[PDB]
Amino acid sequence: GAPATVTEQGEDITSKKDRGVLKIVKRVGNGEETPMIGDKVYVHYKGKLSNGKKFDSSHDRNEPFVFSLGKGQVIKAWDIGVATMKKGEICHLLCKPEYAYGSAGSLPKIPSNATLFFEIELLDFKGE
């Protein structure tokens, strides 16, 4: 399925080239511009665990998730991955635990040492 495909066919987008964050662009976005550090970004997403279960979805809340890019407000994989996206892009990200919740996990939903899969749509980005 999609998680296997990004695992086996995704691009390593880490600066370290440690394969900790892998990406596939699923829908191509607009032009060439990507957000910059500190921008307010608006995304829709769903997340799955490696046991196949959906653990979160903004779509199911009928509201996007909004954060300031590159500030550590989200897991490392998201700061890295969303920074690569164009407006309107949809991507798949595979996030090893070192770029997510590590050995701690995040109770109740995310176990220790969890590799996470996301589908992310970048709706908009703006400077404040």
Side-chain angles (χ1 to χ4, degrees), residues 16-106:
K16 285 200 274 192
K17 317 292 219 185
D18 65 11
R19 288 191 58 97
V21 186
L22 304 176
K23 182 185 180 196
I24 293 174
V25 175
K26 297 293 291 180
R27 180 176 78 201
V28 174
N30 301 331
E32 299 174 24
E33 194 175 7
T34 62
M36 66 172 289
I37 182 169
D39 281 351
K40 190 173 185 176
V41 297
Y42 294 73
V43 301
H44 267 306
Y45 71 100
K46 58 173 151 152
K48 304 197 313 176
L49 298 181
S50 56
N51 68 3
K53 290 187 180 168
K54 168 170 73 180
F55 69 89
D56 197 7
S57 168
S58 60
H59 300 275
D60 294 340
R61 289 188 291 266
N62 304 118
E63 66 177 47
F65 183 80
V66 181
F67 69 103
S68 300
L69 184 66
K71 301 298 168 179
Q73 294 181 356
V74 292
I75 57 172
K76 291 173 178 189
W78 270 52
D79 270 341
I80 295 162
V82 174
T84 72
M85 296 182 72
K86 282 85 162 185
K87 185 169 170 175
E89 180 178 316
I90 304 176
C91 79
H92 289 176
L93 293 181
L94 199 275
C95 311
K96 301 305 290 179
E98 296 78 12
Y99 292 88
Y101 297 95
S103 47
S106 189

Coordinates of all heavy atoms in Angstrom, one line a residue, residues 16-106:
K16 N 20.9 15.2 6.6 CA 21.9 14.2 7.0 C 22.0 13.0 6.0 O 22.9 12.2 6.1 CB 21.6 13.7 8.4 CG 21.9 14.6 9.5 CD 22.0 14.0 10.8 CE 20.7 13.8 11.6 NZ 20.9 13.4 13.0
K17 N 21.0 12.8 5.2 CA 20.9 11.6 4.3 C 20.9 10.3 5.0 O 21.6 9.4 4.7 CB 22.1 11.6 3.2 CG 22.4 13.0 2.6 CD 21.3 13.4 1.7 CE 21.8 14.1 0.5 NZ 20.6 14.6 -0.3
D18 N 20.1 10.3 6.1 CA 20.0 9.2 7.0 C 18.7 8.4 6.8 O 18.4 7.5 7.6 CB 20.2 9.6 8.5 CG 19.1 10.5 9.0 OD1 18.0 10.6 8.3 OD2 19.3 11.0 10.1
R19 N 18.0 8.7 5.7 CA 16.8 8.1 5.3 C 15.7 8.2 6.4 O 14.7 7.4 6.4 CB 17.0 6.7 4.8 CG 17.7 6.8 3.4 CD 17.7 5.5 2.6 NE 16.4 4.9 2.4 CZ 15.6 5.0 1.3 NH1 16.1 5.7 0.2 NH2 14.5 4.4 1.2
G20 N 15.8 9.2 7.3 CA 14.8 9.3 8.4 C 13.5 9.9 8.0 O 12.5 9.8 8.7
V21 N 13.5 10.6 6.8 CA 12.2 11.3 6.3 C 12.3 11.0 4.8 O 13.1 11.5 4.1 CB 12.1 12.8 6.6 CG1 10.8 13.3 6.1 CG2 12.4 13.1 8.1
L22 N 11.3 10.2 4.3 CA 11.2 9.9 2.9 C 9.9 10.5 2.4 O 8.9 10.5 3.1 CB 11.1 8.4 2.7 CG 12.3 7.6 3.3 CD1 12.1 6.1 3.1 CD2 13.7 8.0 2.8
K23 N 9.9 10.9 1.1 CA 8.8 11.7 0.5 C 8.5 11.2 -0.9 O 9.4 10.9 -1.7 CB 9.2 13.1 0.5 CG 8.1 14.1 -0.1 CD 8.5 15.5 -0.2 CE 7.4 16.3 -0.8 NZ 7.8 17.6 -1.3
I24 N 7.2 11.2 -1.2 CA 6.7 11.1 -2.6 C 5.7 12.2 -2.8 O 4.8 12.4 -2.0 CB 6.0 9.7 -2.9 CG1 7.0 8.6 -2.8 CG2 5.3 9.8 -4.3 CD1 6.4 7.2 -3.0
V25 N 5.9 13.0 -3.9 CA 4.9 14.0 -4.3 C 3.8 13.2 -5.0 O 4.0 12.6 -6.1 CB 5.5 15.0 -5.2 CG1 4.5 16.0 -5.7 CG2 6.6 15.8 -4.5
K26 N 2.6 13.3 -4.5 CA 1.4 12.7 -5.0 C 0.6 13.6 -6.0 O 0.0 13.1 -7.0 CB 0.5 12.1 -3.9 CG 1.2 11.1 -3.1 CD 1.4 9.8 -3.8 CE 0.1 9.0 -4.1 NZ 0.3 7.8 -4.8
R27 N 0.3 14.8 -5.6 CA -0.2 15.8 -6.5 C 0.7 17.0 -6.5 O 1.1 17.5 -5.5 CB -1.6 16.3 -6.0 CG -2.2 17.4 -7.0 CD -3.6 17.8 -6.6 NE -3.6 18.8 -5.5 CZ -4.7 19.0 -4.7 NH1 -5.8 18.3 -4.8 NH2 -4.6 19.9 -3.7
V28 N 1.0 17.3 -7.7 CA 2.0 18.4 -8.0 C 1.3 19.8 -7.7 O 0.1 20.0 -8.1 CB 2.5 18.4 -9.4 CG1 3.3 19.6 -9.7 CG2 3.3 17.1 -9.7
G29 N 2.0 20.6 -6.9 CA 1.4 21.9 -6.5 C 1.8 23.0 -7.5 O 2.2 22.8 -8.7
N30 N 1.6 24.3 -7.1 CA 1.6 25.5 -7.9 C 3.0 26.1 -8.0 O 3.6 26.5 -7.0 CB 0.6 26.5 -7.4 CG -0.8 25.9 -7.4 OD1 -1.1 25.0 -8.2 ND2 -1.6 26.3 -6.5
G31 N 3.5 26.3 -9.2 CA 4.8 27.0 -9.4 C 6.0 26.4 -8.7 O 6.1 25.1 -8.6
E32 N 6.8 27.3 -8.2 CA 8.1 26.9 -7.6 C 8.3 27.2 -6.2 O 9.2 26.7 -5.6 CB 9.2 27.5 -8.4 CG 9.3 27.1 -9.9 CD 10.4 27.8 -10.7 OE1 11.3 28.3 -10.1 OE2 10.2 27.9 -11.9
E33 N 7.4 28.1 -5.6 CA 7.7 28.6 -4.3 C 7.3 27.7 -3.2 O 6.2 27.1 -3.3 CB 7.0 30.0 -4.1 CG 7.6 30.7 -2.8 CD 7.1 32.1 -2.6 OE1 6.1 32.6 -3.4 OE2 7.6 32.8 -1.7
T34 N 8.1 27.6 -2.2 CA 7.8 26.8 -1.0 C 7.8 27.8 0.2 O 8.3 28.9 0.1 CB 8.9 25.7 -0.8 OG1 10.2 26.4 -0.6 CG2 9.0 24.7 -1.9
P35 N 7.2 27.4 1.3 CA 7.1 28.4 2.4 C 8.5 28.7 3.0 O 9.4 28.0 2.8 CB 6.2 27.6 3.5 CG 5.9 26.3 2.9 CD 6.5 26.1 1.6
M36 N 8.5 29.8 3.7 CA 9.8 30.0 4.4 C 9.5 29.9 5.9 O 8.4 29.9 6.5 CB 10.4 31.4 4.1 CG 9.5 32.5 4.5 SD 10.4 34.2 4.4 CE 11.6 34.2 5.6
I37 N 10.7 29.9 6.6 CA 10.7 29.7 8.0 C 9.9 30.8 8.7 O 10.0 32.0 8.3 CB 12.2 29.8 8.6 CG1 12.2 29.6 10.1 CG2 12.9 31.1 8.1 CD1 13.6 29.4 10.6
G38 N 9.0 30.4 9.6 CA 8.2 31.4 10.3 C 6.8 31.6 9.6 O 6.0 32.2 10.3
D39 N 6.6 31.1 8.4 CA 5.3 31.3 7.8 C 4.3 30.5 8.5 O 4.5 29.4 9.1 CB 5.4 30.8 6.3 CG 6.0 31.8 5.4 OD1 6.3 32.9 5.7 OD2 6.1 31.3 4.2
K40 N 3.0 31.1 8.5 CA 1.9 30.4 8.9 C 1.5 29.4 7.8 O 1.1 29.9 6.7 CB 0.8 31.4 9.3 CG -0.5 30.8 9.9 CD -1.4 32.0 10.4 CE -2.6 31.5 11.2 NZ -3.4 32.7 11.6
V41 N 1.5 28.1 8.1 CA 1.1 27.1 7.1 C -0.2 26.5 7.5 O -0.5 26.3 8.7 CB 2.2 26.1 6.8 CG1 3.5 26.8 6.2 CG2 2.6 25.3 8.0
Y42 N -1.0 26.2 6.5 CA -2.3 25.6 6.6 C -2.3 24.2 5.9 O -2.0 24.2 4.7 CB -3.4 26.4 6.0 CG -3.7 27.7 6.7 CD1 -2.7 28.8 6.5 CD2 -4.8 28.0 7.4 CE1 -2.9 30.0 7.1 CE2 -5.0 29.2 8.0 CZ -4.1 30.2 7.8 OH -4.3 31.5 8.4
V43 N -2.5 23.1 6.6 CA -2.4 21.8 6.0 C -3.6 21.0 6.4 O -4.3 21.2 7.4 CB -1.2 21.0 6.4 CG1 0.1 21.8 6.0 CG2 -1.1 20.6 7.8
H44 N -4.0 20.1 5.5 CA -4.8 18.9 5.8 C -3.9 17.7 5.8 O -3.0 17.6 5.0 CB -6.0 18.7 4.8 CG -7.2 19.4 5.3 ND1 -7.8 19.2 6.5 CD2 -8.1 20.3 4.7 CE1 -8.9 19.9 6.7 NE2 -9.1 20.6 5.6
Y45 N -4.2 16.7 6.7 CA -3.4 15.6 6.8 C -4.2 14.4 7.4 O -5.2 14.5 8.0 CB -2.2 15.8 7.7 CG -2.5 15.9 9.2 CD1 -2.4 14.9 10.0 CD2 -3.0 17.1 9.7 CE1 -2.7 15.0 11.4 CE2 -3.3 17.3 11.0 CZ -3.1 16.2 11.9 OH -3.5 16.4 13.2
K46 N -3.6 13.2 7.1 CA -4.0 12.0 7.9 C -2.7 11.3 8.2 O -1.7 11.4 7.5 CB -5.0 11.1 7.1 CG -4.5 10.6 5.9 CD -5.4 9.6 5.2 CE -5.3 9.6 3.7 NZ -5.6 8.3 3.1
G47 N -2.7 10.7 9.4 CA -1.6 9.9 9.9 C -2.0 8.4 10.1 O -3.1 8.2 10.7
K48 N -1.1 7.5 9.8 CA -1.2 6.1 10.1 C 0.0 5.6 10.8 O 1.1 6.0 10.6 CB -1.4 5.3 8.8 CG -2.6 5.8 7.9 CD -3.0 4.7 6.9 CE -1.9 4.1 6.1 NZ -2.6 3.1 5.2
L49 N -0.3 4.6 11.7 CA 0.8 3.9 12.4 C 1.2 2.7 11.5 O 0.5 2.3 10.6 CB 0.3 3.3 13.7 CG -0.1 4.4 14.8 CD1 -0.6 3.6 16.0 CD2 1.0 5.3 15.1
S50 N 2.3 2.0 11.9 CA 2.8 0.9 11.2 C 2.0 -0.4 11.4 O 2.3 -1.4 10.7 CB 4.3 0.7 11.5 OG 4.4 0.5 12.9
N51 N 1.1 -0.3 12.3 CA 0.1 -1.4 12.4 C -1.1 -1.2 11.6 O -2.1 -2.0 11.6 CB -0.3 -1.6 13.9 CG -1.1 -0.5 14.4 OD1 -1.4 0.5 13.7 ND2 -1.3 -0.6 15.7
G52 N -1.1 -0.2 10.7 CA -2.2 0.0 9.7 C -3.3 0.9 10.2 O -4.2 1.2 9.4
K53 N -3.3 1.3 11.4 CA -4.4 2.1 11.9 C -4.2 3.6 11.7 O -3.1 4.2 11.9 CB -4.7 1.8 13.4 CG -5.3 0.4 13.5 CD -5.8 0.3 15.0 CE -6.4 -1.1 15.2 NZ -6.6 -1.4 16.6
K54 N -5.3 4.3 11.2 CA -5.3 5.7 11.2 C -5.3 6.2 12.6 O -6.0 5.6 13.4 CB -6.6 6.3 10.5 CG -6.8 7.8 10.6 CD -7.9 8.4 9.8 CE -9.3 7.9 10.2 NZ -10.4 8.5 9.4
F55 N -4.4 7.1 13.0 CA -4.4 7.7 14.3 C -4.9 9.1 14.4 O -5.1 9.6 15.5 CB -3.1 7.5 15.1 CG -1.9 8.3 14.5 CD1 -1.7 9.5 14.9 CD2 -1.2 7.7 13.5 CE1 -0.6 10.2 14.4 CE2 -0.1 8.4 13.0 CZ 0.2 9.7 13.4
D56 N -4.9 9.8 13.3 CA -5.3 11.2 13.3 C -5.7 11.6 11.9 O -5.2 11.1 10.9 CB -4.2 12.1 13.8 CG -4.6 13.5 14.3 OD1 -5.8 13.8 14.3 OD2 -3.7 14.3 14.6
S57 N -6.6 12.7 11.8 CA -7.0 13.3 10.5 C -7.6 14.6 10.8 O -8.5 14.8 11.6 CB -8.1 12.4 9.9 OG -8.7 13.1 8.9
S58 N -7.1 15.6 10.1 CA -7.7 16.9 10.1 C -9.0 17.0 9.3 O -9.9 17.7 9.6 CB -6.7 18.0 9.6 OG -6.3 17.7 8.3
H59 N -9.0 16.2 8.2 CA -10.2 16.1 7.4 C -11.4 15.8 8.2 O -12.5 16.4 8.0 CB -10.1 15.1 6.3 CG -8.9 15.3 5.3 ND1 -9.0 16.2 4.2 CD2 -7.6 14.8 5.3 CE1 -7.8 16.2 3.6 NE2 -7.0 15.3 4.2
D60 N -11.3 14.8 9.1 CA -12.4 14.4 10.0 C -12.8 15.5 11.0 O -13.9 15.3 11.5 CB -12.0 13.1 10.7 CG -11.8 11.9 9.8 OD1 -12.3 11.9 8.6 OD2 -11.1 10.9 10.2
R61 N -12.0 16.5 11.2 CA -12.4 17.6 12.0 C -13.0 18.8 11.3 O -13.4 19.8 11.9 CB -11.1 18.2 12.8 CG -10.7 17.2 13.9 CD -9.5 17.8 14.7 NE -8.3 18.0 14.0 CZ -7.3 17.2 14.0 NH1 -7.4 16.0 14.7 NH2 -6.2 17.5 13.3
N62 N -13.0 18.7 9.9 CA -13.5 19.8 9.1 C -12.8 21.1 9.3 O -13.3 22.2 9.1 CB -15.0 20.0 9.3 CG -15.8 18.7 9.0 OD1 -16.4 18.2 9.9 ND2 -15.7 18.2 7.8
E63 N -11.5 21.1 9.6 CA -10.7 22.3 9.8 C -9.2 21.9 9.6 O -8.8 20.8 9.9 CB -10.8 23.0 11.2 CG -10.3 22.2 12.4 CD -10.4 22.9 13.7 OE1 -11.5 23.5 14.0 OE2 -9.5 22.8 14.5
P64 N -8.4 22.8 8.9 CA -7.0 22.5 8.7 C -6.2 22.6 10.0 O -6.7 23.2 11.0 CB -6.6 23.6 7.7 CG -7.4 24.7 8.1 CD -8.8 24.1 8.4
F65 N -5.0 22.0 10.0 CA -4.1 22.2 11.0 C -3.1 23.4 10.6 O -2.7 23.4 9.5 CB -3.3 20.9 11.2 CG -2.3 21.0 12.3 CD1 -2.7 20.8 13.6 CD2 -1.0 21.1 12.1 CE1 -1.8 20.9 14.7 CE2 0.0 21.2 13.1 CZ -0.4 21.1 14.4
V66 N -2.9 24.3 11.6 CA -2.2 25.5 11.3 C -1.0 25.6 12.2 O -1.2 25.4 13.5 CB -3.1 26.7 11.5 CG1 -2.4 28.0 11.1 CG2 -4.4 26.6 10.6
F67 N 0.2 25.9 11.7 CA 1.3 26.1 12.6 C 2.3 27.0 11.9 O 2.2 27.3 10.7 CB 2.0 24.7 12.9 CG 2.7 24.0 11.8 CD1 4.0 24.0 11.7 CD2 1.9 23.3 10.9 CE1 4.7 23.3 10.7 CE2 2.6 22.5 9.9 CZ 3.9 22.6 9.8
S68 N 3.3 27.4 12.7 CA 4.4 28.3 12.2 C 5.6 27.4 11.8 O 6.1 26.6 12.6 CB 4.8 29.3 13.2 OG 3.8 30.1 13.5
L69 N 6.0 27.4 10.5 CA 7.0 26.5 10.0 C 8.4 26.7 10.6 O 8.8 27.9 10.7 CB 7.0 26.7 8.5 CG 7.9 25.7 7.7 CD1 7.4 24.3 7.9 CD2 8.0 26.1 6.3
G70 N 9.1 25.7 10.9 CA 10.5 25.7 11.2 C 10.8 26.2 12.6 O 11.9 26.6 12.9
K71 N 9.8 26.1 13.5 CA 9.8 26.5 14.9 C 9.7 25.4 15.9 O 9.7 25.7 17.1 CB 8.7 27.5 15.1 CG 8.8 28.8 14.2 CD 10.1 29.5 14.5 CE 10.4 30.5 13.5 NZ 11.7 31.2 13.9
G72 N 9.7 24.1 15.5 CA 9.6 23.0 16.4 C 8.3 22.9 17.1 O 8.2 22.4 18.1
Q73 N 7.2 23.5 16.4 CA 5.9 23.3 16.9 C 5.3 22.0 16.6 O 4.2 21.6 17.1 CB 5.0 24.4 16.3 CG 5.3 25.8 16.8 CD 4.5 26.9 16.3 OE1 3.6 26.7 15.5 NE2 4.7 28.1 16.8
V74 N 5.9 21.3 15.7 CA 5.5 20.0 15.2 C 6.7 19.1 15.2 O 7.9 19.5 15.4 CB 5.0 20.1 13.7 CG1 3.6 20.8 13.7 CG2 6.0 20.7 12.8
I75 N 6.5 17.8 14.9 CA 7.7 16.9 14.9 C 8.6 17.3 13.8 O 8.3 18.0 12.8 CB 7.2 15.4 14.6 CG1 6.3 15.2 13.4 CG2 6.5 14.9 15.9 CD1 6.0 13.8 13.1
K76 N 9.9 16.9 13.9 CA 10.9 17.3 13.0 C 10.6 17.0 11.6 O 10.9 17.7 10.7 CB 12.3 16.7 13.4 CG 12.9 17.2 14.7 CD 14.1 16.4 15.1 CE 14.8 16.9 16.3 NZ 16.1 16.3 16.6
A77 N 10.1 15.8 11.4 CA 9.8 15.3 10.0 C 8.8 16.3 9.3 O 8.9 16.4 8.1 CB 9.2 14.0 10.0
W78 N 7.9 16.9 10.1 CA 6.9 17.9 9.5 C 7.6 19.2 9.2 O 7.4 19.8 8.1 CB 5.7 18.1 10.4 CG 4.6 17.1 10.2 CD1 4.6 15.8 10.1 CD2 3.3 17.6 10.0 NE1 3.3 15.3 9.9 CE2 2.5 16.4 9.8 CE3 2.7 18.8 9.9 CZ2 1.1 16.5 9.5 CZ3 1.3 18.9 9.7 CH2 0.6 17.8 9.5
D79 N 8.4 19.7 10.1 CA 9.2 20.9 9.7 C 10.0 20.7 8.5 O 10.0 21.6 7.6 CB 10.0 21.4 10.9 CG 9.3 22.4 11.9 OD1 8.2 23.0 11.5 OD2 9.8 22.5 13.0
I80 N 10.7 19.6 8.4 CA 11.5 19.3 7.2 C 10.6 19.1 6.0 O 10.8 19.7 4.9 CB 12.4 18.0 7.5 CG1 13.4 18.3 8.6 CG2 13.1 17.6 6.2 CD1 14.0 17.0 9.2
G81 N 9.6 18.3 6.1 CA 8.8 17.9 4.9 C 7.9 19.0 4.4 O 7.8 19.2 3.2
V82 N 7.2 19.7 5.3 CA 6.3 20.8 4.8 C 7.1 21.9 4.1 O 6.7 22.5 3.2 CB 5.4 21.3 5.9 CG1 4.6 22.5 5.4 CG2 4.5 20.2 6.4
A83 N 8.4 22.1 4.6 CA 9.2 23.1 4.0 C 9.5 22.8 2.5 O 9.9 23.7 1.8 CB 10.5 23.2 4.8
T84 N 9.4 21.6 2.1 CA 9.7 21.2 0.7 C 8.5 21.3 -0.2 O 8.6 21.1 -1.4 CB 10.2 19.7 0.6 OG1 9.1 18.8 0.8 CG2 11.4 19.5 1.5
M85 N 7.3 21.6 0.3 CA 6.1 21.5 -0.4 C 5.7 22.9 -1.1 O 5.9 23.9 -0.6 CB 4.9 21.1 0.5 CG 5.1 19.8 1.1 SD 3.7 19.3 2.1 CE 2.4 19.0 0.8
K86 N 5.1 22.7 -2.3 CA 4.5 23.9 -3.0 C 3.0 24.0 -2.5 O 2.3 23.1 -2.1 CB 4.5 23.7 -4.5 CG 5.9 24.0 -5.1 CD 6.9 22.9 -5.0 CE 8.1 23.0 -5.9 NZ 8.9 21.8 -5.9
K87 N 2.4 25.2 -2.7 CA 1.0 25.4 -2.4 C 0.2 24.5 -3.3 O 0.4 24.4 -4.6 CB 0.6 26.9 -2.7 CG -0.8 27.1 -2.3 CD -1.2 28.6 -2.3 CE -2.7 28.8 -2.1 NZ -2.9 30.3 -2.0
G88 N -0.8 23.8 -2.8 CA -1.6 22.8 -3.5 C -1.0 21.5 -3.6 O -1.7 20.5 -4.1
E89 N 0.2 21.3 -3.2 CA 0.8 19.9 -3.3 C 0.2 19.0 -2.2 O -0.1 19.4 -1.1 CB 2.3 20.1 -3.0 CG 3.1 18.7 -3.0 CD 4.6 19.0 -2.8 OE1 5.2 19.9 -3.4 OE2 5.1 18.2 -1.9
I90 N 0.1 17.7 -2.7 CA -0.1 16.6 -1.7 C 1.1 15.7 -1.8 O 1.5 15.3 -2.9 CB -1.5 15.8 -2.1 CG1 -2.6 16.8 -2.1 CG2 -1.7 14.7 -1.1 CD1 -4.0 16.2 -2.5
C91 N 1.6 15.3 -0.6 CA 2.7 14.4 -0.5 C 2.4 13.3 0.5 O 1.5 13.4 1.3 CB 4.0 15.0 -0.2 SG 4.3 15.5 1.5
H92 N 3.2 12.2 0.4 CA 3.3 11.2 1.4 C 4.7 11.3 2.1 O 5.7 11.5 1.4 CB 3.2 9.8 0.8 CG 1.8 9.5 0.4 ND1 1.4 8.3 -0.3 CD2 0.7 10.2 0.6 CE1 0.1 8.4 -0.5 NE2 -0.4 9.5 0.0
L93 N 4.7 11.3 3.4 CA 5.9 11.3 4.2 C 6.0 10.1 5.1 O 5.0 9.7 5.8 CB 6.0 12.5 5.2 CG 6.2 13.9 4.6 CD1 6.3 14.8 5.8 CD2 7.4 14.0 3.7
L94 N 7.1 9.5 5.1 CA 7.4 8.3 6.0 C 8.5 8.9 7.0 O 9.5 9.4 6.6 CB 8.0 7.2 5.2 CG 8.0 5.7 5.7 CD1 9.2 5.4 6.4 CD2 6.8 5.3 6.3
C95 N 8.2 8.8 8.3 CA 8.9 9.5 9.3 C 9.4 8.5 10.3 O 8.6 7.9 11.1 CB 8.0 10.5 10.1 SG 7.0 11.6 8.9
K96 N 10.7 8.2 10.3 CA 11.3 7.3 11.3 C 11.2 8.0 12.7 O 11.1 9.2 12.8 CB 12.7 7.0 10.9 CG 12.9 6.3 9.6 CD 12.0 5.0 9.4 CE 12.5 3.9 10.2 NZ 11.6 2.6 10.0
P97 N 11.3 7.2 13.8 CA 11.1 7.8 15.1 C 12.0 8.9 15.5 O 11.6 9.8 16.3 CB 11.1 6.6 16.0 CG 11.5 5.4 15.3 CD 11.4 5.7 13.8
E98 N 13.2 8.9 15.0 CA 14.2 10.0 15.3 C 13.7 11.3 14.8 O 14.2 12.4 15.3 CB 15.5 9.7 14.8 CG 16.2 8.4 15.3 CD 15.7 7.1 14.8 OE1 15.0 7.0 13.8 OE2 16.1 6.0 15.5
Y99 N 12.8 11.3 13.9 CA 12.2 12.6 13.3 C 10.7 12.7 13.7 O 10.0 13.5 13.2 CB 12.4 12.6 11.8 CG 13.8 12.7 11.4 CD1 14.6 11.6 11.2 CD2 14.4 14.0 11.2 CE1 16.0 11.8 10.9 CE2 15.7 14.1 10.8 CZ 16.5 13.0 10.6 OH 17.8 13.2 10.3
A100 N 10.3 11.9 14.7 CA 8.9 11.9 15.2 C 9.0 11.9 16.8 O 9.5 12.8 17.4 CB 8.1 10.8 14.6
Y101 N 8.4 10.8 17.4 CA 8.3 10.8 18.8 C 9.3 9.9 19.5 O 9.3 9.7 20.8 CB 6.9 10.4 19.2 CG 5.9 11.5 18.8 CD1 5.2 11.4 17.6 CD2 5.7 12.6 19.6 CE1 4.3 12.4 17.2 CE2 4.8 13.6 19.2 CZ 4.2 13.5 18.0 OH 3.3 14.5 17.5
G102 N 10.3 9.3 18.8 CA 11.4 8.7 19.4 C 11.0 7.5 20.3 O 10.0 6.8 20.1
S103 N 11.8 7.2 21.3 CA 11.5 6.1 22.2 C 10.4 6.5 23.2 O 9.8 5.6 23.7 CB 12.8 5.8 23.0 OG 13.5 6.9 23.5
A104 N 10.1 7.8 23.4 CA 9.1 8.2 24.3 C 7.7 7.8 23.8 O 6.8 7.5 24.6 CB 9.2 9.6 24.6
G105 N 7.5 7.9 22.5 CA 6.2 7.9 22.0 C 5.3 9.0 22.5 O 5.9 10.1 22.9
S106 N 4.0 9.0 22.3 CA 3.2 10.0 22.8 C 1.8 9.4 23.1 O 1.0 9.0 22.2 CB 3.0 11.2 21.8 OG 2.3 12.2 22.4

